[PDB]
Structures are given as structure tokens and as C-alpha cells.
């Protein structure tokens, strides 16, 4: 069928009381929920690595992406926080820890980040040094970065921006700082994989900048995307920083 | 009251304002969890009236209660 | 025409083929008297040919899953008054092709396949040691 066979599995996000099971135990309602959100999880971002799940998600009618996109622009502490895991793990970027402060989690995605590789018992230097030096390839493909970009592209059209940037400003502090960090990434994969037309654009940022620049809004809205265009600065210098 | 010509003109209202598209958030999400079984059931309803056979409608009326029991927990 | 007839008239008062969808083919026995020259099927002992269309329309009722605890008592009560009319293959035929096109529960479809395991089958089995030798 159309619209109603593929759509189910991303039915545990877009239905806020979700029940799959018409008679289930009473005791197991929280569990099951969590693994509800794990199996949809799995199942999304299983069907955005095949080419008939990304055309048939993103098709320009009442397709399923926009369904995603839109229940993320609703303040619900719950979903809200759960499909930015799924955002994360289908660009394939790391997580930040679970914290209220900016510069806490900002040091958690530092791709010079210790890791138990390159320990001496493990993988002493050689582990190592593949992380932090680059390849010695300058004009090889790297599909990868094919795949990346026409993902990227597909979420761009369908609004993804603005509902992060919906989610940095009317959120709480936890998420605020992961959507923050999710921005952040995101532009900074824009100005590398994506073509110049596609995101010459994109670092204006008019919905974040009027926001913070307009003195009719309430004062928090303004100061809060101001610290959010503060932090996105930061994250760039981090990122032109490099791994040490 | 075995009364299928009732239940029919009962949830036909029913089909015909979820065949014209969800328009809201709730509604997508709606189409989403249960609208697959409440096609099978119209297609069981259907395919029963077309040839009168309770063996048709059992299939539909199982679609609906399966449904129904979601929607009511 | 039996199903709007149970509604206004009880069992017990009813009582002072039935097989709607049965042809040669799709039946277990019937199919092999053409091809194996198997022994036309006996006569059973309109007594019998009532409970038959009764347990099919209780067996089709088991299908929606509405009230299925009635159901069952009522098949339950049927086995137990007449252990008997559990035993004809040309019912369990019908049953089990029921089976092959509906949608039953995985309990009901377990129960309803228990009804028919304590039977005997004698004559299909003495036909099917005759058509060998
Ligand atoms: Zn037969």
C-alpha cells in the first residue's frame, strides 16, 4: 500500500500514545515503551541506508519525513529528546554526554577525544595515529560522502534547520545543548560535502538571527539564540581547531 | 440486531473522511498506526456486500475489533 | 440461511449435507475414490447432518474473535454430549479448509485443531491398507 504499510515503523514517534499491543501486561508499560523506541530507532535508520526506503520516505507528497520533522517542532520533552538520537546515529556523528552546560558537551564530541584503542597494551600509536592524521587520498570519491551529502540534501528541503532551531530556542537545557550540537555538526558537514549552490545559503541562518536580533520577542528568546549563535561560533573554532 | 445495512451506513462516514487525507499531525499519525487494518476491513466489507457471505464480514469485523481494542486502551 | 434460523431457534429444541464448501476436490478422503478407487464414504449413523452445519457456524462465529469464550463453551458442550460427530474426515476436511482461508487466532486455531485429535479415522485407514495390497 501507499502511505500506510512502510509508515508504521516510524508510528511509536509520530503517535505520542502509542500502543502496539491491544492486551499486554499493565506492570511492563515504561519498558515497553523503551523498547518500542529502540525497535523503531533500529528500523528507521535501517531503511535510511537502502535507496527504496530513502525514495520512499522522501517522496514529495505527505511523505514520512515531514511527519518526522513536524512532531519535532512540538515541545515534547519525551519525543523530542528521543528522535535527536535517531538524527545522530543516521549522520553517523557522535554523541555528546548528558549535560546542561555547552562546554561539557562540546569536549565529548572532540575528535582528539582518549580512547581504549590506543592504549599500549591495545594499539599504542598505530590506532592512534589513524585518528587524529589524516588519509594521504586528496581527489579519491569516498562514497561515503556521497551518501552523506544526498541524505543532508533530502533533510534540508524538507525543513530540518528550522526545527533545530525551533528545538535550540523553545526547549529545555539538555536538549538544547544537543540540537545546538547537532547544528553544529550539520553546518559544519554542509560547508565540506554539500555542492556551493546547495550551501552558500545556509550559514546566514535568517530564522535563528531574527530571532536574536529582534526587541519586540520576549528577552529570554532573544539571549538564548544569542547564546546559541555564541556556541555555534565556538563549535566552528573547535572544529578549525583540528585533533592534536 | 444482526442489522449489517446499519453498522454499513454507521462507519461508511468513517472510511469516507479518512480517504480524503490527514490534514493535521494527530491525523498523520493516526493514518499511520491504524490505517492499514481499516482498508483491509473496508476492502472484507466490501468484497462481503459484493457477495453476501458472513464469511467475509468475520475477517472485516476481526480487522475492527483488533483495532478497536487498540484504540480504547 | 441456517445462521439467521439459530438466532430465534435453541439446540435442545431444534433437535425434535451440512457442508456448505465441500466438492471432491479439497476434501482429504473424497479426492482419493477417482484417482486410488478409494471406497465410496459410508453412511453415519438428518440427526447427524444438524450438528455438522452447527459446529461449522460455531467454528465460523470462532472467527471474528468477538466472543470467543462462548464459543468454545458451546463446541466444548458439543464434543461432550456427542463424541461422535467429531469423527467424520468429511467434516474435519471442512473444518481444516476453513482454516486455510480465514483468519483465526493462534489460540482458537490451536483449540480448533485439538477438537479433532482424539479420533480414530478407522475407515480411510482400512480403505488406504486395501488399495495397497
Ligand atoms: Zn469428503
Redesign the interface.
Same mark, same amino acid.
Given at each position: 500500500r501507499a502511505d500506510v504499510e512502510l509508515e508504521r515503523i516510524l508510528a511509536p514517534y509520530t503517535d505520542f500514545h502509542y500502543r502496539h499491543s491491544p492486551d499486554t501486561a499493565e506492570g511492563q508499560l515504561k519498558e515497553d515503551r523503551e523498547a518500542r523506541f529502540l525497535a523503531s530507532k533500529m528500523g528507521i535508520i535501517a531503511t535510511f541506508r537502502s535507496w527504496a526506503g530513502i525514495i520512499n520516505l522522501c517522496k514529495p507528497g505527505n511523505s514520512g519525513i515531514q511527519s518526522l520533522i513536524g512532531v519535532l517542532c512540538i515541545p515534547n520533552m519525551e519525543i523530542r529528546r528521543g528522535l535527536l538520537e535517531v538524527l545522530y546515529d543516521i549522520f553517523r556523528l557522535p554523541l555528546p554526554v548528558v549535560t546542561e552546560e555547552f562546554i561539557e558537551a562540546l569536549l565529548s564530541v572532540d575528535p582528539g577525544r582518549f580512547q581504549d584503542s590506543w592504549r599500549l597494551s591495545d594499539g599504542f600509536v598505530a590506532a592512534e595515529a589513524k585518528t587524529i592524521l589524516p588519509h594521504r587520498a586528496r581527489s579519491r570519491p569516498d562514497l561515503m560522502d556521497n551518501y552523506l551529502a544526498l541524505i543532508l540534501s533530502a533533510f534540508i528541503r524538507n525543513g530540518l534547520l528550522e526545527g533545530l532551531v525551533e528545538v535550540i530556542t523553545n526547549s529545555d537545557d539538555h536538549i538544547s545543548v544537543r540540537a545546538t550540537i547537532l547544528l553544529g555538526e550539520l553546518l559544519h558537514m554542509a560547508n565540506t560535502i554539500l555542492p556551493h549552490s546547495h550551501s552558500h545559503h545556509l550559514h546566514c541562518l535568517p530564522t535563528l538571527m531574527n530571532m536574536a536580533a529582534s526587541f519586540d520577542i520576549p528577552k529570554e528568546k532573544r539571549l538564548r539564540a544569542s547564546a546559541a549563535l555564541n556556541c555555534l561560533k565556538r563549535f566552528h573554532e573547535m572544529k578549525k581547531r583540528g585533533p592534536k | 440486531e444482526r442489522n449489517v445495512k446499519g453498522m454499513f451506513e454507521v462507519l461508511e462516514p468513517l472510511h469516507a473522511m479518512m480517504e480524503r487525507g490527514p490534514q493535521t499531525l494527530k491525523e498523520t499519525s493516526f493514518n499511520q498506526a491504524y490505517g492499514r487494518d481499516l482498508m483491509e476491513a473496508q476492502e472484507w466489507c466490501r468484497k462481503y456486500m459484493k457477495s453476501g457471505n458472513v464469511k467475509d464480514l468475520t475477517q472485516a469485523w476481526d480487522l475492527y475489533y483488533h483495532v478497536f481494542r487498540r484504540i480504547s486502551k | 440461511s441456517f +445462521? *439467521?434460523l439459530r438466532?430465534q431457534m435453541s439446540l435442545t429444541e431444534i433437535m425434535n449435507t451440512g457442508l456448505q464448501e465441500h466438492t471432491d476436490d479439497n476434501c482429504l478422503y473424497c479426492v482419493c475414490i477417482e484417482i486410488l478407487g478409494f471406497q465410496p464414504s459410508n453412511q453415519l449413523s438428518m440427526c447427524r447432518i444438524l450438528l455438522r452445519k452447527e459446529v461449522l457456524r460455531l467454528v465460523?462465529?470462532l472467527?471474528?474473535?468477538?466472543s470467543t469464550k462462548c464459543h468454545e463453551t458451546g463446541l466444548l458442550t458439543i464434543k461432550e454430549k456427542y463424541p461422535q460427530t467429531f469423527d467424520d474426515i468429511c467434516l474435519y476436511s471442512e473444518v481444516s479448509h *476453513?482454516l486455510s +482461508?480465514?483468519?483465526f487466532r493462534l489460540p482458537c486455531r490451536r483449540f480448533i485443531q485439538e477438537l479433532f485429535q482424539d479420533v480414530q479415522f478407522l475407515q480411510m485407514h482400512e480403505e488406504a491398507e486395501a488399495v495397497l495390497a
Open positions: - | - | +445462521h *439467521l438466532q465460523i462465529n472467527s471474528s474473535s468477538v *476453513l +482461508h480465514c483468519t
